[PDB]
């Protein structure tokens, strides 16, 4: 993976109010010395989880969730990694949640190739009208505003040239499912 840039994408942990920690099998995968950047959708919700992210990578980016204690976090962020402009927002601002029309407006407003958002606690990674939309879900399986059957998940973006290969990690039963999703810039 020389020349690849590995970006961990996760959020909605809701530690400690809703969950105590990440699943054991996720923690065995998330080890220091591999990830280059972390893009976090927020709702950590405390400094202890931010410190944990810093153990995984030096470059940690977080946006403000509606339950985060740290009010210094920006509401939204745009970053460039390789050839991709990437937008990041927690997503409680999007009503109804996950609304495709509202996310596409945010894509155009941020002017990004990839838009990352959270809040639904439901993993999604898909291309729509030649732009890419990622929701990493909740890496702890925290309950959301509506329901409790939440699949723990996170995403890893492997960026090279104008291609991103998005690896999705889901805890289904007690086993980790891994799938690979490709998106190419035009």
């Amino acid at each position: 993976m020389a020349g690849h840039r590995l970006v961990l994408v996760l959020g909605d942990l809701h530690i400690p109010h809703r969950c105590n920690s990440l699943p054991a099998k996720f923690k065995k995968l998330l080890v220091p010395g591999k990830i280059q950047h972390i893009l976090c959708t927020g709702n950590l919700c405390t400094k202890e989880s931010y410190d944990y992210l810093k153990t995984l990578a030096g470059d940690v980016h977080i946006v403000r969730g509606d339950f985060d204690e740290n009010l210094n976090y920006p509401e939204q962020k745009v970053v460039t990694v390789g050839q991709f402009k990437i937008g990041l927002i927690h997503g409680h601002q999007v009503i109804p949640w996950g609304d495709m029309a509202s996310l596409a407006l945010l894509q155009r407003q941020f002017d990004v190739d990839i838009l990352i958002s959270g809040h639904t606690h439901k993993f999604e990674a898909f291309e729509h009208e030649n732009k890419f939309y990622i929701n990493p879900g909740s890496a702890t399986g925290a309950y959301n505003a509506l329901e409790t059957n939440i699949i723990p998940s996170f995403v890893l973006m492997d960026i090279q040239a104008s291609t991103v290969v998005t690896y999705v990690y889901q805890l289904i039963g007690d086993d980790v499912k891994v799938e690979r999703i490709e998106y190419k810039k035009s």
């Binding site: 690896y167 990690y169 891994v178």
Partner: peptide, 7 residues
């Protein structure tokens, strides 16, 4: 391969 970049 099986766990991608985290394997």
């Amino acid at each position: 391969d099986p766990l991608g970049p985290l394997g």
